[PDB]
């Protein structure tokens, strides 16, 4: 009654049969700019059924040994469908998303992955050049992966300093799989400003680090994929002009 | 009474009126929405310097 769920956004559905429960980040909907705090003069654009819709992006196997994944929004739909199109014709953009991560097993498997939303995901360069001149700073595909996404490197620190422990205040989720095998979450849109850029800043990034390690005997099945799955909520595009892809 | 055309200019001497009376702007001007106006004659944008 609790574990079957069915979110569908535009002409797109996913259902899921383990899932038990929709984390609503901080408790607010996504919602469109009130006039009461909007600062652009021009009328933006709502095509509410050509984006918001549920974008597949590639699958990434999870490997015994693997160390987690990152990905940054709006960054990865930036080529894909109208959401890409009006992303690289507008200049102001606005949007909440809605995330869905699958990675089933069978009832033999076992691990456990955590599946956090950061705000402001700020990476960072590793090494220990102390002068602003000579440090490492990561690179533009380190840091705007795409829709490929990229793979994190020690994520005891998020690549970012800060401990994996404490992340738990994030809006995030686990993915066990003794119990659960998806999960989902509803962010709002989370800026200092009422619209911005969707190809220069991106709001926050998606983790899923597998915490417990995949486990599992012999005989069983060794390709276990993940696949996560975005929908653009209440999206509004301002500012057009030609297309610039960044 | 006797030459008026010395007081009817006199009398018509007052402080003319130049109306163009100011208000108290606390805030910055807002702005109303607008559709498209496909109307012939009236044209804001053509002005005159």
Same mark, same amino acid.
């Given at each position: 009654?609790?574990?079957?769920?069915?979110?569908?956004?535009?002409?797109?559905?996913?259902?899921?049969?383990?899932?038990?429960?929709?984390?609503?980040?901080?408790?607010?909907?996504?919602?469109?700019? +009130?006039?009461?705090?909007?600062?652009?003069?021009?009328? $933006?654009?709502?095509?509410?059924?050509?984006? =918001?819709?549920?974008? #597949?992006?590639?699958?990434?196997?999870?490997?015994?040994?693997?160390?987690?994944?990152?990905?940054?929004? $709006?960054? %990865?739909?930036?080529?894909?469908?109208? !959401?890409?199109?009006?992303?690289?014709? *507008?200049?102001?953009?606005?949007?909440? !998303?809605?995330? *869905?991560?699958?990675?089933?097993?069978?009832?033999?498997?076992?691990?456990?992955?955590?599946?956090?939303?950061?705000?402001? !995901?700020?990476?960072?360069?590793?090494?220990?050049?102390?002068? &602003?001149?000579?440090? &490492?700073? $990561?690179?533009?595909? #380190?840091?705007?992966?795409? #829709?490929?996404?990229?793979?994190?490197?020690?994520?005891?620190?998020?690549?970012?300093? %800060? &401990?994996?422990?404490?992340?738990?205040?994030? $809006?995030?989720?686990?993915?066990?799989?003794?119990? =659960?095998?998806?999960?989902?979450?509803?962010?709002?849109?989370?800026?200092?400003? +009422?619209?911005?850029?969707?190809? =220069?800043?991106?709001? !926050?990034?998606?983790?899923? %680090?597998? %915490?417990?390690?995949?486990?599992?005997?012999?005989?069983?099945?060794?390709?276990?994929?993940? #696949?996560?799955?975005?929908?653009?909520?209440?999206?509004?595009?301002?500012?057009?002009?030609?297309?610039?892809?960044? | 009474?006797?030459?008026?055309?010395?007081?009817?200019?006199? /009398?018509?001497?007052?402080?003319?009126?130049?109306?163009?009376?100011?208000?108290?702007?606390?805030?910055?001007?807002?702005?109303?929405?607008?559709?498209?106006?496909?109307?012939?004659?009236?044209?804001?944008? /053509?002005?005159?310097?």
């Amino acid at each position: 009654s609790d574990r079957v769920a069915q979110l569908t956004v535009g002409n797109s559905s996913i259902t899921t049969q383990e899932a038990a429960n929709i984390v609503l980040a901080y408790g607010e909907w996504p919602e469109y700019c +009130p006039d009461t705090d909007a600062t652009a003069v021009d009328k $933006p654009t709502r095509p509410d059924v050509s984006v =918001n819709r549920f974008y #597949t992006l590639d699958s990434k196997m999870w490997q015994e040994n693997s160390t987690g994944w990152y990905w940054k929004f $709006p960054d %990865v739909l930036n080529k894909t469908g109208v !959401f890409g199109q009006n992303a690289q014709f *507008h200049y102001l953009y606005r949007s909440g !998303f809605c995330l *869905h991560v699958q990675c089933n097993a069978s009832k033999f498997h076992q691990g456990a992955l955590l599946v956090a939303v950061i705000p402001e !995901f700020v990476l960072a360069g590793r090494g220990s050049n102390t002068k &602003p001149n000579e440090a &490492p700073h $990561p690179g533009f595909n #380190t840091t705007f992966p795409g #829709t490929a996404g990229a793979s994190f490197n020690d994520p005891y620190v998020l690549d970012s300093g %800060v &401990p994996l422990s404490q992340s738990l205040i994030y $809006p995030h989720q686990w993915i066990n799989l003794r119990t =659960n095998n998806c999960a989902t979450i509803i962010v709002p849109y989370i800026n200092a400003v +009422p619209f911005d850029s969707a190809i =220069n800043h991106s709001n !926050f990034g998606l983790i899923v %680090v597998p %915490v417990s390690p995949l486990k599992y005997s012999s005989g069983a099945t060794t390709a276990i994929p993940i #696949t996560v799955t975005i929908a653009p909520l209440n999206s509004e595009f301002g500012g057009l002009r030609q297309a610039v892809s960044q | 009474d006797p030459v008026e055309d010395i007081i009817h200019d006199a /009398l018509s001497s007052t402080v003319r009126r130049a109306i163009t009376s100011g208000q108290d702007v606390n805030t910055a001007a807002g702005t109303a929405p607008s559709s498209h106006r496909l109307e012939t004659g009236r044209v804001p944008a /053509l002005q005159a310097a």
